Amino acid sequence: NGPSRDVKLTFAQIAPPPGSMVLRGINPNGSIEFGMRSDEVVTKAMLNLEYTPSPSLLPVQSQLKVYLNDELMGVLPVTKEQLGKKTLAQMPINPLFISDFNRVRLEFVGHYQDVCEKPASTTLWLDVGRSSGLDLTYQTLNVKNDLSHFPVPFFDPSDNRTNTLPMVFAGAPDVGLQQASAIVASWFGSRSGWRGQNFPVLYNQLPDRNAIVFATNDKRPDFLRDHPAVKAPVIEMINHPQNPYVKLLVVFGRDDKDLLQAAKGIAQGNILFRGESVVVNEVKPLLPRKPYDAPNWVRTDRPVTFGELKTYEEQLQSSGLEPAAINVSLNLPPDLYLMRSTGIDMDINYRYTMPPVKDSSRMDISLNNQFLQSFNLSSLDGKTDVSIPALKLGATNQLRFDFEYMNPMPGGSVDNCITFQPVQNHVVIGDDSTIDFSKYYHFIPMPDLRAFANAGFPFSRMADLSQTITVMPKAPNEAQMETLLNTVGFIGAQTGFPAINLTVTDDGSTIQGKDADIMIIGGIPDKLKDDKQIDLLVQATESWVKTGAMAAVIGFQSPYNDQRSVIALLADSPRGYEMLNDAVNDSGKRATMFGSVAVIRESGINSLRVGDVYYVGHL
Amino acid sequence: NGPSRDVKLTFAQIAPPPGSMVLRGINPNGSIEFGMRSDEVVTKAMLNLEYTPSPSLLPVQSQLKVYLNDELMGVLPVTKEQLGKKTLAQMPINPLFISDFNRVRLEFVGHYQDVCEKPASTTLWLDVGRSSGLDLTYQTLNVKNDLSHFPVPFFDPSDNRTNTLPMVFAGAPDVGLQQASAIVASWFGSRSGWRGQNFPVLYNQLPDRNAIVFATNDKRPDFLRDHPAVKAPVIEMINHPQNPYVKLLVVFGRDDKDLLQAAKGIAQGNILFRGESVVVNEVKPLLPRKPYDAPNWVRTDRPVTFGELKTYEEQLQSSGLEPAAINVSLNLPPDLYLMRSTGIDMDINYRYTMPPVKDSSRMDISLNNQFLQSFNLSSKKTDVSIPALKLGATNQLRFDFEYMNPMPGGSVDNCITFQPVQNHVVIGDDSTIDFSKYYHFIPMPDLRAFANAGFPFSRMADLSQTITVMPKAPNEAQMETLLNTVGFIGAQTGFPAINLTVTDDGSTIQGKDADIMIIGGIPDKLKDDKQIDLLVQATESWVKTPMRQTPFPGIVPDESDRAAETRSTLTSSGAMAAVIGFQSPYNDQRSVIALLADSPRGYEMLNDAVNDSGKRATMFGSVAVIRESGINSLRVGDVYYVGHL
Question: A272 and B120: CB-CB below 8 Å?
Answer without folding.
Answer: no
